[PDB]
Design a protein around this ligand. Structure first.
Ligand SMILES: Cc1c[nH]c2ncnc(N3CCC[C@@H](CO)C3)c12
Ligand SMILES: Cc1c[nH]c2ncnc(N3CCC[C@@H](CO)C3)c12
Ligand SMILES: Cc1c[nH]c2ncnc(N3CCC[C@@H](CO)C3)c12
Lengths: 302, 296
């Protein structure tokens, strides 16, 4: 670990996983030995994917998540490094395994069959977070997971900010991506709040417009609420009450959708961290995420 | 001539242990997962080493951290890797494996990395004098036949006391592999190959395929829980009942266990009948355990 200049990095707090994905002709019959058409060993997870996108955009970035030593962590660490991601903030667990999965994509019908391996590795805690020196970060993005612990992380950033001049304040964003009640208290934190179409739909909202208008009362004064709605583009709503929208930039053919949401989030953060307007950041997010949809993985999203 | 050589594949097996076989389009949580060194010839080496037999492995490997895991695993077992055909181009093959805990059924989705297979030229470089037995996992047929001819030629310039015993495994039902029938003192033919050729039992497959073997060879056919059979030059059919564990939890590498145990028993001077029983016994014990430890 080298010298990191003060206020230089974008930190993403969240999950990492190893997805081994095999493309097959037909679904394997039990007890057989078959040859797949293609196989990919892919690093995944929301905060993890956002870090890859930030590095490709030209931002110094860091990942903070829980990992346990082992073969899976070795591959994942080498993959983060291959993507220029700073792993120095990883919270190494003394017991357990790093999450991984085996996925089979049937070419004949596009069906995804997944076998998850999760040893319920302890999440990043408020005590893990207090030990971090915040000065090297200009932006902190939190993937909503263990809400009561994450609220303490958010309150610690808020206390740091109170004692800083405006140019030295750390910008904060949160993502509420899973429809779990406990996460809904995170709407009340951060400068930028991302709400997924899936959470919006589970809350009974039928469009990005309904979601923003219906959830804006849950956000902090002055915060921007953002909701991507796949092929319908994305919307943002700020304190001025003006609903902002950008149309989608669909690829010629959609090849890979995992994790186009994470590419959108990382692109919005990047553009806002560069001093661009909410409208400009929305458009940039739609452009990059839309481009990612027609590409396998993250190469060439530029 | 004190080591046993196995020529074939070394594969990283990513294993998921499930309570029931996954239904298509489902998302399930497995009981447990592990990385295990696989590949047929590679698994036979693991078994030969636990049986106490000095052994060596010969197959293609590409450098990296996965190869570092495979190599350190070979070395931990005490398998000699000095003959590994190290590549500069490609990556190590890996497979996604499902093991059903309710019956021990194993389902393998192999990723073949187009790694160049071991050639006749790579084998010519092998100093045959250190080996008492050479087993070849059938893959690139024409190249393997030249390796077999090289062992045959070596044997002609040796007394019957210093002759290298040869075994061949025809596991995949691929036409090219049927010439290997063919060569060697012992020919292992899978139930899978036998069924594809229209045979319904190990005995019917042995009578139907004995014409294809070289003079004085022994043809061996394992048939899972029906046990295993063998046929030698005397025309006498030999059978061994299986040794099923009360709870079959992992049959991954059970076939490799049977092959290595038969080879070991025969390399020790036991009869074909005794070697068959031994193969069934060790493979059966393996079936009731996860992996290879405790087969003793
Ligand atoms: C990389 C790694 C795998 N398993 C680990 N377990 C504990 N600490 C680690 N390290 C030590 C070097 C410095 C640091 C990375 O930047 C953390 C690791
Ligand atoms: C552009 C596109 C075509 N088909 C899609 N399907 C799903 N998501 C999409 N994304 C990714 C998230 C962000 C969203 C902003 O427009 C676009 C697309
Ligand atoms: C003993 C047993 C129970 N269930 C099995 N299922 C598959 N193979 C089996 N093996 C291993 C290969 C060799 C075969 C010996 O004839 C037995 C078994």
């Amino acid at each position: 670990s080298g010298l990191v200049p003060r206020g230089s990095q974008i930190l993403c707090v969240g999950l990492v996983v190893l997805d081994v994905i095999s493309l097959v002709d037909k679904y394997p019959k039990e007890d057989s030995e078959i040859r797949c058409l293609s196989q990919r060993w892919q690093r995944g997870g929301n905060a993890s994917n956002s870090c890859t996108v930030l590095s490709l955009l030209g931002a110094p970035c860091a990942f903070m998540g829980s990992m346990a030593p082992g073969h899976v962590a070795d591959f994942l660490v080498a993959d983060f490094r291959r993507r220029g991601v700073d792993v120095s903030q990883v919270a190494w667990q003394s017991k357990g395994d790093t999450p991984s999965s085996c996925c089979i994509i049937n070419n004949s019908n596009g069906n995804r069959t997944i076998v998850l391996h999760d040893t319920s590795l302890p999440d990043v805690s408020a005590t893990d977070f207090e030990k971090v020196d915040l000065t090297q970060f200009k932006w902190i993005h939190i993937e909503g997971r263990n809400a009561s612990e994450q609220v303490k992380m958010l309150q610690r950033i808020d206390a740091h900010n109170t004692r800083q001049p405006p140019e030295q304040k750390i910008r904060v964003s949160v993502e509420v991506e899973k429809p779990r009640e406990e996460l809904f208290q995170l709407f009340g934190y951060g400068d930028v709040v991302f709400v997924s179409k899936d959470v919006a739909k589970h809350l009974g909202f039928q469009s990005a417009e309904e979601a923003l208008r219906g959830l804006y009362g849950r956000v902090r004064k002055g915060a921007v609420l953002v909701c991507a709605w796949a092929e319908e583009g994305a919307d943002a709503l700020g304190p001025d009450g003006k609903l902002l929208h950008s149309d989608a930039f669909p690829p010629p053919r959609v090849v890979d959708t995992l994790g186009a949401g994470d590419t959108f989030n990382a692109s919005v953060i990047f553009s806002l961290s560069q001093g661009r307007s909410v409208q400009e950041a929305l458009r940039f997010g739609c452009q990059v995420a839309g481009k990612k949809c027609g590409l396998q993985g993250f190469d060439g999203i530029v």
